[PDB]
């Protein structure tokens, strides 16, 4: 319930910095959108694993 | 208008977390969304950084 709305949530962050940092053409603006897809795509694995 | 985007979105996540968290009555549950609360707030501050 919760978690699956927590799920969603995070699936479309991923799926909106995927675009956005494939498009930044400044470089500082680039590490920093991958770097916080990283961390989506990792939320989504951890609200995968607990329970 | 990509990072006003994903800006709200980490205002969102960082509202369900903190809802989930606080709700959460099993201790390792509750560590897990507050450590991505704490993530997402990580991350709010991160996109000020190239707003
Ligand atoms: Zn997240
Ligand atoms: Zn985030």
Redo the contacts between chains.
């Keep these: 319930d ?2 699956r ?2 799920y969603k ?2 699936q ?2 991923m799926k ?2 995927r ?2 940092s494939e ?1 930044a053409r ?1 470089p ?2 680039k590490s ?2 991958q ?2 897809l990283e ?1 989506e795509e990792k ?1 989504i694995e ?1 609200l995968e694993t ?1 329970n």
Tied chains: 1, 2.
Excluded: G, S
Aim: glycine share 0%.
């Design positions: 919760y978690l709305e927590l949530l995070e479309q962050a909106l910095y675009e956005a498009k400044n500082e603006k920093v959108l770097k916080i961390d939320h951890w607990i």
